[PDB]
Symmetry: C3
Subunit: 107 residues, 3 copies
């Protein structure tokens, strides 16, 4: 509403898959940095049943204006269709860090 | 003001977190709850510096369901005033956002 | 957005540093609470190689009003010139928790 930069969260099934997508996304300079956490548990339902995946969390720091491309790359590379993939607004931070994200970006 | 929220919260151990996540998703109040591995919280209680081990939770949900998610989690939580904070979702993969929406009846 | 309170994400090169900065933050009463997670893997470019460091993740919960001092403190204690340090807006939560945050920052 509308922020210059975005914090994206996702998960991969797997930490090798997370790594592949991560590095792709950094080589291409679509994201300045991707963080891959240690395994999380996701509880959801499908669709009358309560489900329990063991997953790998990813945080993507980026420019909003690069969002559609990142979405496309990540989701294309992800084994599921309909992966967790959500964005929250970056609303401030250390200026020179914020500017690095911006400078690194292929705009 | 967003259609959807990312909620951060903390439980004292994995067992209480998992049984709160299950409730919240059985109740169709959250589409998905993520439980992380343990996490060190540092905070001041007696004007003294404390260190609890906790498990972190992320809840993806519709803003409209927030009051119920709040109460559910807070009543079930052992602490009087636990950590519970809302963050805006302002984008994502459409079919994923849609699956969150579809999944609350309201 | 212009929120009362922020969620800040940041990162330290190891847990001892995270602890040291956490402690400072909490004993200065700049942040009511600070969360140090278990290691994460950060992927980013430097000198146009693809790097991955293991890092310790931090969440800071605070009043937007304290922000300038938190940034100042965290950035200067951090060993890198340009640490990861971003804020996202808190737009809601358990009233008495947000209060507690509000009350723990001396006025």
């Amino acid at each position: 509403y509308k922020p210059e930069q975005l914090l994206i969260f996702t998960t991969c099934p797997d930490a090798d898959i997370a790594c592949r997508i991560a590095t792709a996304l950094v080589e291409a300079k679509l994201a300045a940095c991707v963080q891959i956490g240690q395994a999380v548990e996701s509880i959801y339902q499908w669709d009358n049943n309560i489900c329990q995946s063991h997953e790998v969390p990813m945080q993507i720091k980026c420019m909003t204006t690069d969002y559609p491309a990142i979405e496309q790359l990540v989701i294309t590379m992800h084994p599921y269709e309909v992966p967790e993939f959500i964005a929250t607004p970056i609303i401030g931070g250390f200026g020179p860090y914020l500017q690095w994200i911006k400078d690194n970006s292929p705009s």
